[PDB]
């Protein structure tokens with residue numbers, strides 16, 4: 348419980364750090380009894396690292412790992428995601444026996460400590476290619492062996508998508524066809540994209556959401572929020588604004604719970 | 611080899627009948643040893659029913675079942691899909707021990723007779739909400755009981771999406787959490803939408819595709835094809851055209867095998 352198990356996130360800059368701060372605050376809001384840890388890289392300002400230390404039990408400094416895999420990253424219109432190979436450092440955290448990695452663009456809506464009943468590698472399906480798991484939420488076991496194996500495969504073969512999700516799916520390739528218990532229910536990693544892609548399903552299953560994941564190039568922190576009206580201002584033709592409940596929650600927590608700690 | 615087992619499709623009009631014909635032609639092309647069955651409703655022309663008899667072993671006339679659920683259908687911008695409850699008639703086919711239902715907008719790329727090793731209900735995940743199965747390819751056991759249960763649920767509750775897929779997911783509730791063997795690999799029902807949603811995944815898994823599913827409002831038969839050049843004429847800004855190989859194959863089979871029976 349308290350000592351040997353953690354939620355782990357990652358930030359390589361101050362932008363994704365506002366995400367990590369909101370994630371962290373949401374985990375506390377829902378009364379986790381596990382540690383909170385964030386992996387941070389040198390591009391995170393000293394000032395931000397100090398703020399991160401008020402929310403996370405530990406801020407762990409690591410080196411950026413970058414795929415440099417511009418062809419594969421362009422293939423999915425995510426030229427900026429090569430630095431997500433930095434996620435692989437999560438397996439080096441052998442101070443813990445089991446952890447849940449969560450993307451810095453996630454938000455917790457309910458206690459999810461029952462994830463620690465799972466075993467490596469448990470993750471939810473990805474809505475793009477559902478025989479791949481989405482790497483935004485996964486339950487794993489820190490291991491120097493698994494760490495080095497993952498580093499080796501990344502250096503030798505890279506990632507089919509140029510980020511962490513490809514390589515993690517290739518390494519944990521039995522996921523689609525194994526033990527159904529290793530398929531986390533989709534409500535533990537609810538892709539913002541699924542809300543508009545199959546709204547009828549969201550309408551009957553979404554009230555049970557435990558985690559929302561703002562996956563895709565547009566992040567909550569790239570909107571403009573007016574605290575007085577609670578209005579979110581978006582770019583034109585944004586399909587996520589037809590169901591904005593999770594975006595508003597994100598901003599509520601940031602303005603209320605994170606903002607006071609920033610100053 | 612199975613005289614007591616069939617593939618089953620559905621058509622309510624002459625337009626999806628072109629799809630059924632191409633699907634049936636593709637099952638023959640890949641040497642199925644099973645029977646081929648199409649459910650058709652009164653709106654299919656007499657001349658079309660006769661053409662369907664050259665491809666399918668059985669053309670079975672059934673009444674249209676229509677949810678009339680404009681609210682849920684409109685939720686997913688598919689106002690025409692209420693007649694998909696007609697699919698429920700497939701459970702009445704107790705001449706067969708086991709069947710694979712396939713949507714009329716599917717296209718077989720390899721022999722898939724190994725699907726008959728599965729048991730009801732086996733289906734692939736839906737890319738919008740992957741804890742629901744897509745109802746375009748599924749293995750089931752004809753049964754008067756299951757048939758009547760499904761009709762009663764449709765009459766009482768309707769479908770959460772106004773079509774067959776919602777009601778079938780509600781009825782086969784345990785799919786997301788049961789027996790992984792009942793999760794068909796995504797290659798047995800490859801959603802055309804998944805090609806452009808996670809292109810990197812397509813690039814490394816796509817060569818293994820056994821079935822493609824042209825799901826969504828635009829169907830292969832709504833394009834304009836030039837057989838001289840083998841170019842497909844699309845509506846503007848069509849995302850599927852960046853990877854057109856499956857559409858081209860649909861039109862080749864249509865033009866070579868099917869259109870001669872029509873025009």
Ligand SMILES: O=c1ccn([C@@H]2O[C@H](COP(=O)(O)OP(=O)(O)O)[C@@H](O)[C@H]2O)c(=O)[nH]1
Nearest residue numbers: 357358359360363431450451452483562563
């Ligand atoms: O510039 C970046 C890009 C990503 N990340 C980390 O890598 C994760 C995966 O990236 P993202 O969530 O943007 O991928 P997606 O969920 O959109 O596929 C993020 O949540 C962050 O934890 C980061 O720290 N800096």
Ligand SMILES: O=c1ccn([C@@H]2O[C@H](COP(=O)(O)OP(=O)(O)O)[C@@H](O)[C@H]2O)c(=O)[nH]1
Nearest residue numbers: 620621622623626694713714715746825826
């Ligand atoms: O007007 C219609 C619409 C649907 N269908 C049948 O119902 C299936 C499901 O509809 P569709 O494939 O359009 O749904 P999607 O796969 O796009 O969700 C089709 O493949 C056909 O077999 C039909 O016969 N007539």
Ligand SMILES: [Mn+2]
Nearest residue numbers: 450452483562
């Ligand atoms: Mn993410």
Ligand SMILES: [Mn+2]
Nearest residue numbers: 713715746825
């Ligand atoms: Mn279909």
